[PDB]
Amino acid sequence: DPKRLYCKNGGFFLRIHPDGRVDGVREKSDPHIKLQLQAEERGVVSIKGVSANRYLAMKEDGRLLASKSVTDECFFFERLESNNYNTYRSRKYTSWYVALKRTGQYKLGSKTGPGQKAILFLPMS
């Protein structure tokens, strides 16, 4: 089924716009927060925005944006942490994580790290 990824840092839902922008929103009815998390290899997933029809990707400078095609920058290690929230770490840039600030804007991948509340998400139906 699709899922919404709820971030612990503020209570936002990750949102993928049709033009490629990524941000967060608290509205549970927004259509742009319904995502498809597919398994690629074990422990590795790609994240697609259903309406937008685009794939979340992290770039070499930490930016988050969603592309129409699937490239190496679109896969993330999915881990269930001991506190039962999930984290999504880039497979290409292995120290960076998907994350949202408490203002609803995304947090650059270079400023992220374990221990932060910005990288923790809870996938919901």
Describe the structure.
Helix content is 0%, strand content 39%. By secondary structure, the protein is an all-beta fold. It has a single domain (1-125), classed as Trefoil (Acidic Fibroblast Growth Factor, subunit A) (Trefoil). Strands 4, 5, 6, 7, 8 and 9 form a 6-stranded antiparallel sheet that branches. A 4-stranded antiparallel sheet has the order 3-2-1-10, with no helix packed on it. The protein is globular.
Ordered list of secondary-structure elements with their pairings:
Layout lengths: L3 E4 L4 E5 L5 E4 L9 E7 L2 E6 L4 E5 L5 E4 L8 E5 L5 E5 L30 E4 L1
Antiparallel strand pairs: 1-2, 1-10, 2-3, 4-5, 5-6, 5-8, 6-7, 8-9
Key phrases:
125 residues; mainly beta; Trefoil (Acidic Fibroblast Growth Factor, subunit A); 6-stranded antiparallel β-sheet; 4-stranded antiparallel β-sheet; 0% helix; 39% strand; globular; Fibroblast growth factor 2; growth factor; monomeric; basic fibroblast growth factor
Short description:
One of its GO terms (biological process) is positive regulation of epithelial tube formation. Its main location: secreted. The chain has strands spanning about 5, 10-15, 20-25, 35-40, 45-50, 55-60, 65, 75-80, 85-90, 120-125.
